């Protein structure tokens, strides 16, 4: 409804309806659309195969 004491002014809608990110996350997890969380593998240090037998 347009304001009566403020001609031409109406309360705006936020850029998002429910400003919460959790309900979308649980919907895709329920729908099996999300990959599993990733922990970066420990990158091995450079070695010298000409001397390091291992």
């Amino acid at each position: 409804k347009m304001a009566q004491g403020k001609s031409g002014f109406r309360i705006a809608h936020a850029q998002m309806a429910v400003p919460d990110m959790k309900r979308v996350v649980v919907a895709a997890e329920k729908a099996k659309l999300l990959r599993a969380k990733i922990v970066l593998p420990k990158v091995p240090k450079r070695a010298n195969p000409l001397k390091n037998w291992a």
Partner: protein, 53 residues
């Protein structure tokens, strides 16, 4: 748009009024800090008095 009920208290006796009042829709407006900063930066200069050497 349920707009939950809001209780009205008595200032003298402290007893809450039996009839709650719905939450006005102005309390569901987007909370924009940037837009307020734009307006407050301007209107805060409107009380200033002219000066000059």
């Amino acid at each position: 748009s349920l707009r939950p009920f809001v209780t009205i208290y008595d200032g003298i006796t402290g007893e809450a009024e039996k009839t709650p009042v719905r939450l006005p829709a102005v309390f569901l407006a987007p909370i924009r800090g940037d837009v307020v900063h734009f307006v407050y930066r301007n209107q805060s200069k409107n009380t200033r008095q002219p000066e000059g050497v």
